[PDB]
């Protein structure tokens, strides 16, 4: 048994919930959030943003010197820093943008990131301003991940969309 509350079950493993991440990571205290991130781990906007705004920006002084030690990221992969006041840990993963012209093939190998943690509050990769389809997000999700994902989708149109059209 975990904390997390009101989700509907799509698959053995994976969630989905109408909430906002920030809520929920404040609410839950998960072991692990995901943040949309980019390479350079600029949390100007999206769920990045929301996140660092959240930690008073002390995500992003993390992660500006995680970058001067260690360079940039690379499109489809993360790296683990602190949760701060959200969470135990937080998951920076790249998905592709799609409006910086990045391989959409690159998504399954983002999310491939999540099966290195039990259970994890995530968002949809590469969903909102990075310009993919949330369809098929949470289609390469539930065919990629086989750990325990519990998705928060801001938009409750988008929520309603996801689930109507789930096969
Ligand atoms: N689940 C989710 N929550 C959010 N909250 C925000 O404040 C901004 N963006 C998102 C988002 O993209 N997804």
Known sequence: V?????????????????????????KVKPTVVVNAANVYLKHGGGVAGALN????????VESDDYIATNGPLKVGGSCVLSGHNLAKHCLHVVGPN????????????????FNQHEVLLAPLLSAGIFGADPIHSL???????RTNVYLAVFDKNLYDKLVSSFL
Request: net charge negative.
């Open 53 to 60: 705004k959240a930690t008073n920006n002390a995500m992003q």
């Open 2 to 26: 975990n904390s997390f509350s009101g989700y509907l079950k799509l698959t053995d493993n994976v969630y989905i919930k109408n909430a906002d991440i920030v809520e929920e990571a404040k």
């Open 98 to 113: 799609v409006n910086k012209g990045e391989d959409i093939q690159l998504l399954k190998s983002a999310y491939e990131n």
């Open 139 to 145: 289609r390469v999700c539930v065919d990629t991940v």
